[PDB]
Amino acid sequence: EPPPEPRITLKVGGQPVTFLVDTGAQHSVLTQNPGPLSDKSAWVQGATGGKRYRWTTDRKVHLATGKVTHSFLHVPDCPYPLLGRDLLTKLKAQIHFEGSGAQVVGPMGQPLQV
Amino acid sequence: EPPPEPRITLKVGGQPVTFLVDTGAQHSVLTQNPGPLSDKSAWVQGATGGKRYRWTTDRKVHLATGKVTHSFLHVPDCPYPLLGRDLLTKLKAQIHFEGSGAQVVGPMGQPL
Numbered sequence: 001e002p003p004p005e006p007r008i009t010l011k012v013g014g015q016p017v018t019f020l021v022d023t024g025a026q027h028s029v030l031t032q033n034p035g036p037l038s039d040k041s042a043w044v045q046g047a048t049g050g051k052r053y054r055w056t057t058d059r060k061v062h063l064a065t066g067k068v069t070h071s072f073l074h075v076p077d078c079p080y081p082l083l084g085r086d087l088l089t090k091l092k093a094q095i096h097f098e099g100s101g102a103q104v105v106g107p108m109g110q111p112l113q114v
Numbered sequence: 115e116p117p118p119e120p121r122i123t124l125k126v127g128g129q130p131v132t133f134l135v136d137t138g139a140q141h142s143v144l145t146q147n148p149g150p151l152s153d154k155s156a157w158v159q160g161a162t163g164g165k166r167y168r169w170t171t172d173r174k175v176h177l178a179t180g181k182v183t184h185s186f187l188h189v190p191d192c193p194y195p196l197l198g199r200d201l202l203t204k205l206k207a208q209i210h211f212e213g214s215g216a217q218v219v220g221p222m223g224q225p226l
Contacts, residue, residue, distance in 0.1 A: 046162035
C-alpha cells in the first residue's frame with residue numbers, strides 16, 4: 001504494497017482505491033485500472049518533469065462527507081493513486097502528524113483509514 | 115507569487131523559505147540557489163518519471179519548538195520548495211482543509 005501514511009481507502013466507481021493523501025497534488029490521480037477514459041487530456045507538471053495525460057470519465061466517489069461525482073487524471077507513471085486538494089477540500093479533511101505516523105480525520109473529528 | 119495553500123514559511127540557513135506543504139513528499143525539497151551540496155544524490159520518483167538529484171549539506175532549520183539540522187533534496191525541476199513528511203513529523207503538524215483554504219498548525223492548534 002500500500003502507499004505510506006497518510007492514506008485513505010475510498011470506494012471509487014464501486015471499487016476500493018487506497019490513496020496516498022497528497023496535499024501537494026492539485027488534482028487526484030488513478031494509476032492502474034482507471035476504467036473508461038475521456039478523450040480530454042491535461043498537462044501534468046510533476047517534481048521531475050511534465051507530461052500529457054488523459055482524464056477518466058465521471059466516477060461516483062464515496063466520501064465520508066457524502067458521495068460526489070469526480071473525474072481523475074490517469075497517470076500510469078505515478079507510483080501511488082493520489083488524493084489531491086480537489087477532493088481534500090470536499091472532505092474538509094484534517095491530517096495529523098502528532099503521534100506515530102499520520103492519520104486522516106474528517107470534519108466531525110472521526111478518524112478515517114485505508 | 116507564493117505556492118498554493120497549504121503553505122508555511124520556515125527559516126532555513128538563516129533565511130525564510132515559503133514551502134508548499136506536501137504530504138505526498140517523502141523528503142523535503144529546495145529548488146533554487148540551495149547552497150552547498152553533498153556529494154551524495156537520491157533517485158527521486160515524481161508523478162511523471164524519475165531521475166537523480168543532489169542532497170544539500172546539513173542546514174539549520176527553525177521549527178516551532180527548537181532548531182533542527184536537516185538536509186534537503188535540491189530539485190530544480192520542481193516549481194516550489196516542498197515541506198514533506200520528514201519535517202511534518204518533526205513539527206508534529208496538523209493540516210486543516212476549511213472552506214476552500216488550507217491551514218497548517220502545530221501539535222496543539224498553534225498556527226504556523
